[PDB]
Design a binder for this molecule. Structure first.
Ligand SMILES: C[C@@H](O)c1nc2cnc3[nH]ccc3c2n1[C@H]1CC[C@H](CC#N)CC1
Length: 293
């Protein structure tokens, strides 16, 4: 008799689903090698009132971004950037937008407001985020100031997980294959030499990130700048080897100006050449807390 259609089942609204047609690009926020993040307004009413979100997509790998999304989705911590959702057909990760941006952007513009005490609190907060990540059996592999987002003058959050990887149960490390675009000047020796990644490797990276925090992410003070000073800036493809050598010799980044030795000693506990000799995120927390009392 009559044209048979399907009975429409009552459609809910998934608050973690962002319709592409309503996601309006405002501007670029930053990139990785294969990923990029844009500021957008999710503006379903079309009057520029919608919330601002950070949208992560692939540069023209889908499986790695899906993995990153599964990681972020199930991380619940105040020092971890918030998952808001996804936008699907292909996929985009939707996160909270932090207007102060990363430490690289915020620190140089707010030096006057940010004293050693606030920096130690950030450092504490970065350790708590990382420790949490470590308890989820993840290694981050990209801990640097550019990935530490400023929520407020009193709060930072780890704001990217493009390189994050689970470590198998009953295993101490993750062996990486693709290492082309490694942040070598943030990387522990075991990473630079054997492509192995421990939680301890992230402790090393934190030391370098802490050093960035302490130099207010000044570009002329970056671990890359300073390292290319110690080893030479014109070794091309021998750079990494020259790096591993220097580190073998016991050379590390120098103490930041106006950084008390006691803070610098916690930093150097991070840069123990052997992973088993490095401090842990919880000991760093205890250390920093000690300095704040
Ligand atoms: C300015 C830039 O550092 C920045 N501002 C942000 C505000 N909210 C955000 N939410 C998620 C990222 C993010 C933000 N990012 C960058 C953080 C690192 C990221 C690295 C990659 N890909 C690129 C965006």
């Amino acid at each position: 008799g009559d044209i048979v259609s399907e009975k429409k089942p009552a459609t809910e609204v998934d608050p973690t689903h962002f319709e592409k047609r309503f996601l309006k690009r405002i501007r670029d926020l930053g990139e990785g090698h294969f990923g990029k993040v844009e500021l957008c307004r999710y503006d379903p009413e079309g009057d520029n009132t919608g919330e601002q979100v950070a949208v992560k997509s692939l540069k023209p790998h889908i499986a790695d971004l899906k993995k990153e999304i599964e990681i972020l989705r199930n991380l619940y911590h105040e020092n971890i950037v918030k998952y808001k959702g996804i936008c699907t057909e292909g996929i985009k990760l939707i996160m909270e937008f932090l207007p102060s941006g990363s430490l690289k952007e915020y620190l140089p513009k707010n030096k006057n407001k940010i004293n050693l005490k606030q920096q130690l609190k950030y450092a504490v907060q970065i350790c708590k985020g990382m420790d949490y990540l470590g308890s989820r059996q993840y290694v981050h592999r990209d801990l640097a100031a550019r990935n530490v987002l400023v929520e407020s003058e009193h709060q930072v959050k780890i704001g990217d997980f493009g390189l994050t990887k689970a470590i198998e149960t009953d295993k101490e490390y993750y062996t990486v294959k693709d290492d082309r675009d490694s942040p070598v000047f943030w990387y522990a020796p075991e990473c630079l030499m054997q492509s192995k990644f421990y939680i301890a490797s992230d402790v090393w990276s934190f030391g370098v990130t802490l050093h960035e925090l302490l130099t207010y992410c000044d570009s002329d003070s970056s671990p890359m700048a300073l390292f290319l000073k110690m080893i030479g800036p014109t070794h091309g493809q021998m750079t990494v080897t020259r790096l591993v050598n220097t580190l073998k010799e016991g050379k590390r980044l120098p103490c930041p100006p106006n950084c008390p030795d006691e803070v610098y000693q916690l930093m150097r506990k991070c840069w123990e050449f052997q992973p088993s000799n490095r401090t842990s995120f919880q000991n760093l927390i205890e250390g920093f807390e000690a300095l704040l009392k």
